[PDB]
Amino acid sequence: YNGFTGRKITSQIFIGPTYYQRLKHMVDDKIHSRARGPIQILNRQPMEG
Amino acid sequence: PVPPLSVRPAVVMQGSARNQDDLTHKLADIVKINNQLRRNEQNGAAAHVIA
Amino acid sequence: MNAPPAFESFLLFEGEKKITINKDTKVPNACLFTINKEDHTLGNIIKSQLLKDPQVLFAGYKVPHPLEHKIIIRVQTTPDYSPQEAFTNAITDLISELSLLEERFRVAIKDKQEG
RNA sequence: AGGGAACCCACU
Numbered sequence: 001y002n003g004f005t006g007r008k009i010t011s012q013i014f015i016g017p018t019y020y021q022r023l024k025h026m027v028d029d030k031i032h033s034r035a036r037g038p039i040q041i042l043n044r045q046p047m048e049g
Numbered sequence: 050p051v052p053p054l055s056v057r058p059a060v061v062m063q064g065s066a067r068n069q070d071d072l073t074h075k076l077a078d079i080v081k082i083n084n085q086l087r088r089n090e091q092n093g094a095a096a097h098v099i100a
Numbered sequence: 101m102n103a104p105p106a107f108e109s110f111l112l113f114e115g116e117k118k119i120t121i122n123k124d125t126k127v128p129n130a131c132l133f134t135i136n137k138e139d140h141t142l143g144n145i146i147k148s149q150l151l152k153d154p155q156v157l158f159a160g161y162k163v164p165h166p167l168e169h170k171i172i173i174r175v176q177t178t179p180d181y182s183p184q185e186a187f188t189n190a191i192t193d194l195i196s197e198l199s200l201l202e203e204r205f206r207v208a209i210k211d212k213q214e215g
Numbered sequence: 216a217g218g219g220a221a222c223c224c225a226c227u
Binding site for chain 1: 101
């Protein structure tokens with residue numbers, strides 16, 4: 001049944017228990033932005049990483 | 050020509066000793082050998098050592 | 101890091117209005133009701149009750165974005181009627197039905213408990 | 216005021 005309206009879904013749905021894994025890759029360890037931060041000594045371009 | 054310091058920056062490192070670029074070490078070798086060779090001319094020396 | 105607080109889905113922010121009314125100018129006798137901090141529960145019951153009204157030509161609702169907490173209800177009525185009137189009457193009908201249902205559930209519970 | 220190189224693993 002659709003949760004929003006309570007109506008049945010016309011097609012029947014394949015459902016059951018499946019072993020799932022949480023991988024170490026999490027968005028909060030990847031998100032990054034920069035607006036004029038530190039720069040390299042030799043060339044004066046933004047730092048890496 | 051000896052490039053300016055900005056081309057071969059020396060960075061103040063954790064250990065208080067300053068860190069020198071690779072170019073600076075190479076220039077140091079060049080200066081040492083140049084000075085030695087200059088010494089062996091103002092006072093004559095065997096052509097073998099000069100070579 | 102960017103998680104919204106859970107209460108954000110049902111608590112009005114300072115200055116935020118529960119409900120706003122605008123005219124739909126494409127067609128006559130049509131209004132859009134924007135409701136803040138409500139979801140499918142209210143939107144669906146209100147729409148279905150409005151569809152029961154014979155003087156309502158159009159009734160529908162939507163959640164523009166699941167990560168936001170707004171519903172929009174669009175109502176068009178016949179010219180002898182008003183979308184504001186239809187909306188008010190739909191809420192009154194829903195309240196009446198719920199009150200009756202609560203009374204009858206109380207009576208049924210009492211019967212079951214006695215025997 | 217803040218380094219660098221090298222190497223290894225991994226992601227699309």
